[PDB]
Amino acid sequence: MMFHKIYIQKHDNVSILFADIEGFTSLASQCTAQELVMTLNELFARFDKLAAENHCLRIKILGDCYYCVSGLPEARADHAHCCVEMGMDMIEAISLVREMTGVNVNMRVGIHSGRVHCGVLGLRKWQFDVWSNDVTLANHMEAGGKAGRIHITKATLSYLNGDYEVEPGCGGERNAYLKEHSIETFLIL
Amino acid sequence: ATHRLLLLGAGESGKSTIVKQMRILHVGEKATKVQDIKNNLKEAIETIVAAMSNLVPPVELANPENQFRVDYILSVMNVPDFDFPPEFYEHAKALWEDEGVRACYERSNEYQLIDCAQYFLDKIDVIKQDDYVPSDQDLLRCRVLTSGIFETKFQVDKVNFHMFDVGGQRDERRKWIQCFNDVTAIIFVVASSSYNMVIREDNQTNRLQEALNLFKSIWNNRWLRTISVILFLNKQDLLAEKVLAGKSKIEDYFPEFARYTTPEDATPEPGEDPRVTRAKYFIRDEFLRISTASGDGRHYCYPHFTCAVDTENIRRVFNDCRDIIQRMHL
Amino acid sequence: QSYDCVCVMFASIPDFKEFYTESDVNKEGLECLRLLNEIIADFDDLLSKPKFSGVEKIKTIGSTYMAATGLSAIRQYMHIGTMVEFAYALVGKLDAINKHSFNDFKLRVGINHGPVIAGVIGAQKPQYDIWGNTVNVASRMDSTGVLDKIQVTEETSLILQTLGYTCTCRGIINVKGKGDLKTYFVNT
Ligand SMILES: CNc1ccccc1C(=O)O[C@H]1[C@@H](O)[C@H](n2cnc3c(N)ncnc32)O[C@@H]1COP(=O)(O)OP(=O)(O)OP(=O)(O)O
Ligand SMILES: C=C[C@@]1(C)CC(=O)[C@]2(O)[C@@]3(C)[C@@H](O)CCC(C)(C)[C@@H]3[C@H](O)[C@H](OC(=O)CCCCN3CCN(C)CC3)[C@@]2(C)O1
Ligand SMILES: Nc1nc2c(ncn2[C@@H]2O[C@H](COP(=O)(O)OP(=O)(O)OP(O)(O)=S)[C@@H](O)[C@H]2O)c(=O)[nH]1
Ligand SMILES: [Cl-]
Ligand SMILES: [Mn+2]
Ligand SMILES: [Mn+2]
Ligand SMILES: [Mn+2]
């Protein structure tokens, strides 16, 4: 009654995936706004599909930034692999062999694991979102991927139960924020 | 049954001291805070000596000899991690023993200084020892700035309490609302005595009038329009001395005290001079004219004359404070 | 569908990335969202006013409000001045919230106009977002702005003056892809 309801709910052990069309704006100065909004939509259509299959949930979309968390809403201890295969699928999701999208695009997956705080802010035009430093981190993990090799924070490897094959991403050199907190970054193979 | 209390107040009103009273009354390591004590004593003196030349007119010593003891403390003021040598205790103490240093101290309001001054300096002897172990009062007088918010989980009569001390500074008020949500009642804190000193945050605003305007902010806050504040007119002892002594009238700082008469409902404690009686209540009604305006019966204000460094008084009050949480069914 | 004149406005709070603390006191970052909700929500209380009856709230990027006026139609460029009245709107509120949080937030803005290709997207829960370069800049004119000021482009600079608004040239700022462009600030 004092503070508006704030429909937010903590949620402690999930994996968060972030993707960005590497070099997109380059694609822009070449194609019609329409074919772009289309290529974009096209891509995201197949994304929400590859999304619900690996048991993950898509949060929101920002232009070319499509970020889908995992382990929600109902808790799934499987959060690790989820985002992992999400990126997996996401990589082949840019099969330009059938997507005549123009100048070479690629995702820049940036996964991470930690605790969250999801819900919706405001009272109008609600949009489901995720909030937490960990969530801030997974964003920079996205802002630190190479040619779309999947980034995975050391916390993401501790839930992978060492199943996948990762290599030192030397993150931090790639992105300031990773270095700032000295986070050991890897890369799935 | 769990209750959460937030303490608010101007700068150095005496919040943390209360939260310390709390541990003391409801909760060996006294050898790790000895340091901070000496660091107080340090500032205590170096601050007084410092402001002797700066003041206008100047405050010169009576024993010119001490010019060299002045150069000593002034040669250690910015020194990092002082090792505390007997020389310090010495020259400092002789400086305290000096009449012009006290003279500078009787006007310690024209310059920012801590409250534990009078106290610590009067026991350089007791502090200097190698076996000096801070007693209980010594640990409630040791001043330290609170940076952020800390939760003290204590229990009383099989009923839990959660104390929340917060940065009393201005640069700290940006963290209060981080606890404004679902908290029993607000213990406000004031320095009934600080009615003669400008704040540290700027050196131009009356501490008291800043405590009034602060109370105003919380009392009328859009998230505290339902939460009852239990104002704490603290440092009642200091207020008195300043009052009684008269070396600083109250009506020259708050002219609205000239037309002021003494209250009816007043319950004048046991031979508390009529000069004090009137004063302390005056300082009550300044906070009351605020709680009288808005509120609109959604929340009321329960004042409490107090002395945070009196584990005796503080208990009498945190009991009334334990009462109203049960009585008003808060 | 695609429009020919859609005034896009971003209103971010850099000052929040810091205020957001994840501590055991603030229920781990909650109690500050709880305050950010109290803002965004308090910021939405505008869309339901007479003056901003035509103001549309596109979305919300974390601690960044995204509105747009001019999506209810086929002067012709007046809602630009309306969008600004709304920039001035959020500020009135944003600063007022401070008065009760003892905080000090400042609003940073990036208004612009042109063709935006509004529509929905997604296979699950579709969302209504306005794509287009007009918006590309609208954001880049925010991400590089100044607090308490509104950063408008050349043309926007112009139009705003014919409405009674003075504009000062911040200088040049590289709006990536579109290259180095000249921006101005709306004299408050
Ligand atoms: C001329 N550009 C376009 C023509 C029609 C459809 C889209 C574009 C386009 O590239 O739009 C940009 C924003 O307007 C559009 N956008 C929409 N909503 C947005 C938003 N809320 N915040 C930021 N950008 C947003 O996304 C795009 C991302 O730019 P960003 O700077 O985020 O790119 P990047 O993510 O780092 O990609 P790259 O690696 O290639 O540099
Ligand atoms: C609400 C508090 C706080 C501090 C915590 C948080 O998790 C965020 O909500 C994220 C991180 C988080 O939700 C990931 C999505 C997104 C949208 C990216 C948010 C913004 O970056 C927020 O800040 C901002 O508004 C500033 C940065 C926005 C710039 N980013 C750069 C990367 N691209 C891909 C998207 C835009 C955020 C940081 O703010
Ligand atoms: N003489 C006297 N001193 C008191 C009294 N109550 C508190 N103090 C003194 O006030 C000084 C400042 O106390 P403190 O608790 O630090 O204030 P604060 O409100 O907590 O301010 P901060 O520390 O967050 S910035 C301490 O040295 C303490 O002993 C009192 O009733 N009388
Ligand atoms: Cl005060
Ligand atoms: Mn991209
Ligand atoms: Mn982007
Ligand atoms: Mn304190």
GROMACS .gro file of C-alpha atoms and ligand atoms in nm, chain B residues 9-13 188-195 199 206-212 287, ligand 4:
model
   23
  198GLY     CA    1   1.867   1.178   1.232
  199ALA     CA    2   2.095   1.459   1.132
  200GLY     CA    3   2.474   1.431   1.146
  201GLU     CA    4   2.616   1.272   1.461
  202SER     CA    5   2.281   1.284   1.645
  377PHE     CA    6   1.434   0.959   1.492
  378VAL     CA    7   1.741   1.101   1.665
  379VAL     CA    8   1.834   1.460   1.746
  380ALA     CA    9   2.099   1.660   1.924
  381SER     CA   10   1.895   1.888   2.145
  382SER     CA   11   2.236   2.028   2.229
  383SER     CA   12   2.359   2.079   1.872
  384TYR     CA   13   2.132   2.381   1.856
  388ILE     CA   14   2.667   2.087   1.010
  395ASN     CA   15   2.228   2.495   1.187
  396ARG     CA   16   2.249   2.127   1.292
  397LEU     CA   17   1.923   2.156   1.477
  398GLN     CA   18   1.728   2.337   1.205
  399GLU     CA   19   1.868   2.063   0.979
  400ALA     CA   20   1.733   1.799   1.213
  401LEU     CA   21   1.396   1.972   1.200
  476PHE     CA   22   0.962   1.883   1.615
  711CL      CL   23   2.046   1.768   1.505
   0.00000   0.00000   0.00000
